[PDB]
Amino acid sequence: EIVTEEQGTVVQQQPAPAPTALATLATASTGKSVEQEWMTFFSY
Amino acid sequence: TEEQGTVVQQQPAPAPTALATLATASTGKSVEQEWMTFFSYHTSINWSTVESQGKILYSQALNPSINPYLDHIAKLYSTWSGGIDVRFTVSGSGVFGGKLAALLVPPGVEPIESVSMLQYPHVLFDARQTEPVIFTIPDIRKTLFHSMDETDTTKLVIMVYNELINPYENGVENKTTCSITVETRPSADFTFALLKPPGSLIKHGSIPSDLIPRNSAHWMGNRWWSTISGFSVQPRVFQSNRHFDFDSTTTGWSTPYYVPIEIKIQGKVGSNNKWFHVIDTDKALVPGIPDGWPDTTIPDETKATNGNFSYGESYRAGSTTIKPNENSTHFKGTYICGTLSTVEIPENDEQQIKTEAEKKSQTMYVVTADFKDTIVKPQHKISPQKLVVYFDGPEKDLTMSATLSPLGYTLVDEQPVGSVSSRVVRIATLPEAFTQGGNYPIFYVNKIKVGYFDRATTNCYNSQILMTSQRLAEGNYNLPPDSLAVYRITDSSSQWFDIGINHDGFSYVGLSDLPNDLSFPLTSTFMGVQLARVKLASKVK
Amino acid sequence: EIVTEEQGTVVQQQPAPAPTALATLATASTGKSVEQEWMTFFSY
Amino acid sequence: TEEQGTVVQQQPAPAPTALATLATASTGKSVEQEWMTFFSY
């Protein structure tokens, strides 16, 4: 059959934490807010 | 609180928002980071019915590099965190049989090609897959985030569970293959952190993912400029000149490039010989030694007598034997170098030299050794004093400057160039690499023009590919001294084998001997970093 | 299997915009109205 | 009333307060002058 761009069966595996919680700890330390930060400052 | 600078009002104003709308309507813009809405080619895997249980067909660690877009963007940042989905699309025949096991190896653990790895939680997909399998690699870490230099992350491994099998296949020694394409898509929780000041370095060091060119067509040697044509597995590899390590250090006297050798000779009255001394040189790395001065020396001792090429009939193409005694050539193990010489006519006193100055230029034969006016002794420890040139040089007190460019080599025997410690020139020490645990070191081979023979050529060893020497020289790379920068080489056939680069700069292979039948139009791809203690992978017949 | 004259599964492509938008832009600049325009005017 | 100097906006911002929280959670910070909560030789 036909397979699109994100198509595909996703399998789950034993060693596997909480993606979200980890993400938060990162942005917490990082300070991430906007995805394209180079749009918020002037570059030489 | 306050932004530096004052906003002024310009007349031509961007005021319209509709313009944007129009743009959007005709382009169909939705999301801002499109690479997150689709899988993109990463690598391909050819699963063969010869590859047995336990073999690893794929092993990558979570890193921006496993994705085209992710990677190109990472160059802008200094921090990343999050996982990435890896989608495998197996495409074989519905009549085949076989399973493939997937497993996630936590950070701090190096996987090995053993079924032991399966005494750990693992899922498996079959050879006759219908819909793609997506494995999402979690980002297990003990730090709020990752530093662009970090490599020790979760590793995805694909091992052969049950050997692929084809019924319709003949019983005769043959083999069928089942192709599998690997793509990636950054998971939702994936993100780049702080921007990195363009031009800045990575304190701990950039990952060595570009030390070997993608096409073997751009593989020049760090010893001879000719492009690589083969490899040679040796229980010990060594070299010093133009060989750089990950610290960017070099025990040599030349840069990672090939440039003309500006030299300065001096002749003296009454000299029945033709060997000369080098008194000075312009462009030079190590003070006194000319940048690019050949790395090989003469074989044995011999009287400094004028002579020409001369090889017995033991060198006539057709004889599988060569007696090194027939070779009467005195300037053996010498590097042929085209030249453009000039003479410094002394002040107005006696222009008896203006005669030797107007003479046409000769091609000098360079080498490195000790020069006792009567006999030339082979010296493998270079110094501004052991620089020796040989040709039809003037027999009158003089000072001549020349600019030469190595083009060939005075053949000595069947053995390849620089395949022996003793004949390898060095200054302080001589870098080396020995076989370590199933991983043998290699020499990159390329052809070099020879002596008086026809358009013939002999083999020349090289410790690094010119580029590795360049990158490693001008770059800020890094990797644990107990690891290897692994790359996978694929020939223009179904053959391939991994190459690991040592911190010292030498390359290894997981075989005790590489094939000859290698269809040379080659292609290399970075695999990642592995403990040296693990046997480099390969699939060769 | 028998395939008719218009038979076929339509698959949607990732990089594709909304037709209706561009569509009208055309109709608007072009003034398109009927189809066999030659039905609406006498020709020499 | 006025503080000498002008505050400008830098990009890498300290904005996160959670960082502090994490610090605090793993160190167990309570009081600011710890030497006041115990006798010392």
From Swiss-Prot, chain B:
Q: What is the source species?
A: San Miguel sea lion virus serotype 4
From which domain of life does this come? Answer: Viruses
Localization: Virion; Host cytoplasm
Name of this protein: Mature capsid protein
Q: List the disulfide bonds.
A: none
From Swiss-Prot, chain D:
**Cysteines paired by S-S bonds:** none
Domain of life of the organism encoding this protein: Viruses
Where, per UniProt, does this protein localize?
A: Virion; Host cytoplasm
Could you identify this protein by its name?
A: Mature capsid protein
Q: What is the lineage of its organism?
A: Viruses, Riboviria, Orthornavirae, Pisuviricota, Pisoniviricetes
Note the residue range shown relative to the complete protein: 163 to 203 of 703
